[PDB]
């Protein structure tokens, strides 16, 4: 059985109990924290690539009303976003199991762009997920996994300072 965690989970908690925040910007921006996942139960002599994508967590507009976030009333059905595949990808099972995959080099934007950048929706709540993709194998496989403890709004500016003081205190 494939196993698969998130490393720093203790610090994602902070940011989510506060309703975490990540900004996004034309050019794209990097995330903080960083998406670091723990995985095991690969065949070390095996292929796979190792995608990110954000799945919108619900269909609602979220406004930051007097020191908190609250969702619209006019939902719309969310457009998928884009994958994003680790620059490793693909390498063997050995190269992902010896340290936690990091999606240091991710940026998240609000345009439609040359391609790398990941387009989010402003003001729409995002949960993270990824896709382990065995290739070039006989039967291909995907096991997906998704993050609850690393949801976020995505952002134009922070709306909430005790989310700027926890980024800053811990980057
Ligand atoms: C409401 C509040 N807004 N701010 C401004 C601010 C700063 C400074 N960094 O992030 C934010 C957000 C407060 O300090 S309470």
Same mark, same amino acid.
């Given at each position: 059985?494939?196993?698969?965690?998130?490393?720093?989970?203790?610090?994602?908690?902070?940011?989510?109990?506060?309703?975490?925040?990540?900004?996004?910007?034309?050019?794209?921006?990097?995330?903080?924290?960083?998406?670091?996942?723990?995985?095991?139960?690969?065949?070390?002599?095996?292929?796979?690539?190792?995608?990110?994508?954000?799945?919108?967590?619900?269909?609602?507009?979220?406004?930051?009303?007097?020191?908190?976030?609250?969702?619209?009333?006019?939902?719309?059905?969310?457009?998928?976003?884009?994958?994003?595949?680790?620059?490793?990808?693909?390498?063997?099972?050995?190269?992902?199991?010896?340290?936690?995959?990091?999606?240091?080099?991710?940026?998240?934007?609000?345009?439609?762009? *040359? &391609?790398? /950048?990941? =387009?989010?929706? %402003?003001?729409?709540?995002? @949960?993270?997920?990824?896709?382990? !993709?065995?290739? *070039? &194998?006989? /039967?291909? =496989?995907?096991? %997906?996994?998704?993050?609850? @403890?690393?949801?976020?709004?995505? !952002?134009?500016?922070?709306?909430?300072?005790?989310?700027?003081?926890?980024?800053?205190?811990?980057?």
């Amino acid at each position: 059985e494939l196993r698969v965690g998130l490393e720093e989970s203790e610090l994602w908690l902070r940011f989510k109990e506060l309703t975490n925040e990540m900004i996004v910007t034309k050019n794209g921006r990097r995330m903080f924290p960083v998406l670091k996942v723990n995985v095991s139960g690969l065949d070390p002599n095996a292929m796979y690539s190792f995608l990110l994508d954000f799945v919108a967590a619900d269909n609602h507009r979220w406004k930051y009303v007097n020191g908190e976030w609250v969702p619209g009333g006019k939902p719309e059905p969310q457009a998928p976003s884009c994958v994003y595949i680790h620059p490793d990808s693909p390498n063997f099972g050995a190269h992902w199991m010896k340290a936690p995959v990091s999606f240091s080099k991710v940026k998240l934007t609000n345009k439609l762009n *040359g &391609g790398g /950048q990941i =387009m989010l929706n %402003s003001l729409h709540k995002y @949960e993270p997920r990824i896709h382990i !993709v065995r290739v *070039g &194998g006989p /039967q291909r =496989m995907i096991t %997906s996994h998704c993050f609850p @403890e690393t949801q976020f709004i995505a !952002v134009t500016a922070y709306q909430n300072e005790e989310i700027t003081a926890l980024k800053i205190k811990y980057n």
